[PDB]
């Protein structure tokens, strides 16, 4: 049983699109110089050589945004069928969903004030 | 024990062996009498 | 439809938002008050819908019979006491207050939902609200390594146990066709089977993590040491009450009231819990660790409470749990009030306190003694009513064993009184030499100690309560 | 001496036994989440073996 | 005995092999970055398995949340805590594994013994395609409390993580 | 394509997740296994929904709530792990043994 009708192109196209990179890239090794491996493998630090140690001094400046993104991105999945069923539902489900959205906005304001 | 130091100065009474063969007699005495009593 | 059973919950929910908004605008407000006000208003809203109307269901996803009223009011009182404790305890540490009470009220709303639920999805979501809030509050003071370690370990363990519960719930949806309800689930499958037993056991694993039963206990000791203390005070009482309400309302009603092997499993867990907590707390030096293993043993007493379902074992659980609320909150108020002033340390530093602060001594002594089953005191009546019920049905080994483990637990409950009373001024510790000698805490301690010292003889008014509550569960 | 040793020691031994039991059972609690991961789900699955 | 049911079968077994291999890669590989990317692969393969089972919304949501957001969060948190993975072995490093293995294996067999013993109710009716309007109806007819309450769940989780990872 | 092997595949993910849950050395590598367990349960639910209860899908909604809560809980877990990395400066989970 398969009622989705609209697939059997997704599969083959996932195949052909997973096959364009591997094939345009395999049509490069057949015609290209080989490796040149001594000093062309070094790492680009603007002409000079890297200093050493090579750490990053990690920060939450990019973690916290992923955190709040996970929150507000889980949230949207609760809204697509709401919008799509808003024809059938009508009232008392808009009143009941603006609660969801208002508590979301409270979370947004919390993250905003910090 | 070491607290019982008076005219009660019997030496061979605190050893574990003598305590054992004293408790044997006392327990066997009460046991012979409880068997005598039931029957 | 029928939001009237829901009012209490959403009422508390309202103030959650409020206690963030005033905390987002002012950053220093009087939020400790009127949270008490809304919790009192909730417990007041419980009376009009206690017995005046009949039991009703929201949509079938939520039922509000007297049992749910009991557990909801209980968890609300636990949150109230924990707030009254934690106001000037969390302020002593360099941390906020608004997010704290927000999370505490959120856990409270979750546990007040889960006591009246009969549907799988909603059970899981409420359980996860309470669990995640606990995961946070365990690590809210991240300046210490042990707090964060406990929060990590508690989070990971609880996530795994919840996933097991969730697998079992998936199976129970699977079996009997669709049915995500609970009265309809134990309605289309009504016979012993392998998969039903697997689902049973996984749900037992999910619940025992909440009610601290052994071998599902290893989180309680480490977490109760590491975590903030008033967090633990809410955690034990509220998480247990939610767990036991879940146990009844799942195993009895939604799950099955046929495959009654779970009684045997709870006998095993209660036996092990009594034998473990009361024995291993006897070898400790910290209070919070001792209280953890105590809580395990008290859970074992409760578990023999409701393993004998005859309309009195369940009632005995309910009463003893109401009573353990007061008792344990009083003990935690006393250890808070000691750890604030100068001490901030373990059992051996309580010595010689009867000269400095006699009020705290009265409080903690009465609470600890009630936990061990001492006469006139409420815990004694709770334990003897447990024994009455569990003996009436025919469990003979459990009664003797629980009695014996209470006789064992009195030892480590009396060590603290040996310290606080017997130890003379020639044996004070360094902490008590320089002891000096807040308001909401004192009034809470009084309101708690008078209860645990008077709510044992004044018992008929709240045995009628519980026996009115427990007409509803099948048996 | 039979009273102070053969009678008293036998019952004080009860306290000794239920003390050393507590001293030696806490090692079950070892401070390892993986040991709980073992004796949580292997703590059960014995409860299924004598069930069905 | 058909071409349309054959593609479903071949795709299903391919996706299942990918899932198993990538999960074993998550769990066995010493390096953890490879494990994170293979975890993303597991998520994609499971989202492709759901489509065979007439669930498209939840499939797109798994591709949108887990691999999209959570996996990125893990790929941040992992370089937050990389220090050349200098771990010295313990003597019982094998022992624990063995225990886990047999325990885990038993569970599988036990679960398998259920899955092949119980008479499932196959319910021969064609499923419904509109698996998104129906979920909208269920969020406001049956499962409304979880909607309204997961709201405050997400609020509380934000409030928690924001004040547990904050640098101070 | 049958319900039986779907259930078996989910149980195999469950087994593997337990193996990674007990075998783990790191602390971020445990949430990965937990997420695998949650995926397995979702898979069981979707199978039940397709075969057993189709005309009103009811397990798909429950899987939506599952992926929701799992995302939130993973968020909170990584937040805790970021904090323990501040103090102990590692994630070797066998160094978090504060009991003997």
From Swiss-Prot, chain A:
GO molecular function terms noted in the UniProt entry: NADH dehydrogenase (ubiquinone) activity; quinone binding
Keyword check for NAD: yes
Sections of the chain in a coiled coil: none
Family annotation (Gene3D superfamilies): NADH:ubiquinone/plastoquinone oxidoreductase, chain 3
Catalytic activity: a plastoquinone + NADH + (n+1) H(+)(in) = a plastoquinol + NAD(+) + n H(+)(out); a plastoquinone + NADPH + (n+1) H(+)(in) = a plastoquinol + NADP(+) + n H(+)(out)
InterPro entries: NAD(P)H_OxRDtase_bac/plastid, NADH_UbQ/plastoQ_OxRdtase_su3, NDAH_ubi_oxred_su3_sf
HAMAP family on file: NDH1_NuoA (MF_01394)
PANTHER family: NADH-UBIQUINONE OXIDOREDUCTASE CHAIN 3
Task performed by this protein: NDH-1 shuttles electrons from an unknown electron donor, via FMN and iron-sulfur (Fe-S) centers, to quinones in the respiratory and/or the photosynthetic chain. The immediate electron acceptor for the enzyme in this species is believed to be plastoquinone. Couples the redox reaction to proton translocation, and thus conserves the redox energy in a proton gradient. Cyanobacterial NDH-1 also plays a role in inorganic carbon-concentration.
Entry similarity comment: Belongs to the complex I subunit 3 family.
Subunit structure: NDH-1 can be composed of about 15 different subunits; different subcomplexes with different compositions have been identified which probably have different functions.
Protein name: NAD(P)H-quinone oxidoreductase subunit 3
From Swiss-Prot, chain C:
Single GO cellular component term: plasma membrane-derived thylakoid membrane
Any single biological process term in GO: ATP synthesis coupled electron transport
Pfam families in UniProt: Ndh2_N, Proton_antipo_M
Keywords for the protein's UniProt record, in alphabetical order: Membrane, NAD, NADP, Plastoquinone, Quinone, Thylakoid, Translocase, Transmembrane, Transmembrane helix, Transport
Membrane topology designation: Multi-pass membrane protein
Keyword Translocase on entry: yes
UniProt-listed Enzyme Commission number(s): 7.1.1.-
Annotated GO MF terms: NADH dehydrogenase (ubiquinone) activity; quinone binding
Family indicated by similarity: Belongs to the complex I subunit 2 family.
Name of the molecule in the record: NAD(P)H-quinone oxidoreductase subunit 2
Gene transcribed to yield this protein: ndhB
């Amino acid at each position: 049983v398969f009622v989705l009708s609209g697939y059997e192109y997704f599969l083959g196209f996932l195949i052909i699109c997973s096959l364009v990179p591997v094939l345009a890239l395999a049509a490069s090794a057949l015609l290209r110089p080989k490796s040149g491996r001594m000093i062309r493998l070094t790492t680009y630090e603007s002409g000079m050589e890297p200093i050493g140690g090579a750490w990053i001094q990690f920060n939450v400046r990019y973690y916290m945004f992923a955190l709040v993104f996970v929150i507000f991105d889980v949230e949207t999945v609760f809204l697509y069928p709401w919008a799509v069923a808003f024809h059938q539902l009508g009232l008392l489900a808009f009143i009941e969903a603006l609660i969801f959205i208002a508590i979301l906005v409270v979370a947004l304001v919390y993250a905003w004030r910090k | 024990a070491t607290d019982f130091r008076a005219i009660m100065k019997f030496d061979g009474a605190d050893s574990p062996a003598m305590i054992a063969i004293s408790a044997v007699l006392i327990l066997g005495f009460i046991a012979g009498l409880i068997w005598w009593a039931l029957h | 439809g029928t939001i009237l059973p829901e009012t209490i919950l959403i009422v508390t929910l309202l103030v959650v938002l409020l206690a963030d908004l005033i905390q987002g605008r002012q950053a220093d407000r009087w939020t400790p008050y009127f949270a008490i006000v809304g919790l009192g208003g909730a417990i007041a809203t419980m009376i009009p819908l206690w017995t005046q109307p009949a039991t009703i269901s929201f949509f079938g996803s939520f039922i509000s019979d007297h049992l749910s009223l009991f557990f909801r009011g209980l968890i609300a009182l636990s949150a109230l006491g924990t707030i009254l404790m934690s106001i000037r305890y969390v302020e002593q540490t360099g941390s906020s207050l608004g997010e704290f009470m927000t999370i505490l009220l959120t856990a409270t709303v979750g546990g007040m939902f889960i006591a009246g639920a009969q549907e799988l999805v909603f059970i899981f979501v409420a359980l996860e609200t309470l669990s995640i809030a606990s995961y946070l509050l365990t690590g809210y003071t991240k300046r210490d390594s042990r707090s964060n370690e406990a929060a990590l370990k508690y989070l990971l363990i609880g996530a795994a146990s919840s996933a097991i519960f969730l697998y079992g719930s998936s199976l129970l949806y699977g079996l009997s066709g669709g049915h995500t309800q609970l009265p309809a689930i134990a309605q289309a499958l009504s016979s012993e089977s392998l998969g039903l037993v697997v689902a049973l056991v996984f749900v037992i694993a999910g619940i025992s993590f909440k009610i601290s039963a052994v071998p599902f206990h290893q989180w309680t000791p480490d977490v109760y040491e590491g975590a903030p203390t008033p967090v633990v005070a809410f955690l034990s009482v509220g998480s247990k009450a939610a767990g036991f309400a879940l146990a009844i309302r799942f195993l009895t009603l939604a799950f099955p009231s046929v495959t009654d092997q779970w009684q045997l499993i709870f006998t095993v867990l209660a036996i092990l819990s009594m034998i473990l907590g009361n024995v291993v707390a006897l070898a400790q030096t910290s209070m919070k660790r001792m209280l953890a293993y105590s809580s395990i043993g008290q859970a074992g007493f409760v578990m023999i409470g409701f393993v004998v379902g005859t309309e009195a074992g369940y009632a005995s659980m309910l009463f003893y749990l109401l009573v353990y609320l007061f008792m344990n909150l009083g003990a935690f108020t006393c250890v808070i009030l000691f750890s604030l002033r100068t001490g901030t340390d373990q059992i051996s530093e309580y010595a010689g306190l009867y000269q400095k602060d006699p009020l705290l001594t009265l409080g903690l002594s009465l609470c600890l003694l009630s936990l061990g089953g001492i006469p006139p005191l409420a815990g004694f009546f709770g334990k003897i009513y447990l024994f009455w019920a569990g003996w009436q049905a025919g469990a003979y080994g459990l009664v003797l064993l629980g009695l014996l483990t209470s006789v064992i637990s009195i030892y480590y409950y009396i060590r603290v009184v040996k310290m606080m009373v017997v130890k003379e001024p020639q044996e004070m510790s360094e902490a008590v030499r320089n002891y000096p000698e807040l308001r909401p805490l004192q009034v809470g301690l009084v309101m708690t100690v008078i209860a645990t010292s008077l709510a044992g003889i004044l018992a008929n008014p709240l045995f009628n309560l519980v026996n009115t509550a427990v007409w509803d569960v099948p048996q | 001496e039979v009273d102070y040793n053969v009678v008293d020691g036998v019952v004080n031994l009860t306290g000794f036994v239920t003390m050393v039991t507590g001293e030696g059972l806490k090692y079950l609690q070892n401070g390892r989440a993986q040991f709980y991961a073992l004796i949580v789900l292997l703590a059960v699955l014995g409860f299924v073996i004598f069930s069905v | 005995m058909d071409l349309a049911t054959l593609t479903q079968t071949i795709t299903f077994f391919a996706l299942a092999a990918a899932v198993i291999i990538a999960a074993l890669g998550v769990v066995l590989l010493d390096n953890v970055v490879y494990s994170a990317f293979l975890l993303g692969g597991v998520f994609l393969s499971i989202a492709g398995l759901y489509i065979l089972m007439n669930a498209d919304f939840v499939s797109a949501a798994q591709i949108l949340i887990y691999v999209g957001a959570v996996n990125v969060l893990i790929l941040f948190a992992i370089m937050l805590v990389n220090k050349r993975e200098t771990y010295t072995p313990v003597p019982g490093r094998w022992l624990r594994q063995g225990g886990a293995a047999v325990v885990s294996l038993g569970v599988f067999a036990l679960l398998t013994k259920m899955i092949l013993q119980t008479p499932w109710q196959l319910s021969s009716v064609p499923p419904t395609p509109d698996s998104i309007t129906t979920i909208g109806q269920h969020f406001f007819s049956d499962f409304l409390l979880p909607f309204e309450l997961a709201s405050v769940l997400l609020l509380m989780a934000l409030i928690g993580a924001v004040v547990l990872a904050r640098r101070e | 394509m049958q319900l039986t092997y779907v259930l078996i595949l989910a149980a195999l993910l469950f087994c593997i997740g337990i193996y990674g849950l007990v075998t783990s050395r790191n602390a971020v590598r445990v949430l990965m296994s937990i997420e695998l367990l949650l995926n397995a349960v979702n898979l069981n639910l979707i199978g039940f929904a397709n075969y057993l209860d189709g005309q009103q899908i009811k397990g798909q909604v429950f899987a939506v709530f599952v992926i929701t809560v799992a995302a939130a809980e993973a968020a909170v877990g990584l937040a805790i792990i970021l904090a323990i990395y501040r103090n102990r400066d590692t994630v070797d989970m066998e160094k978090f043994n504060l009991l003997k």
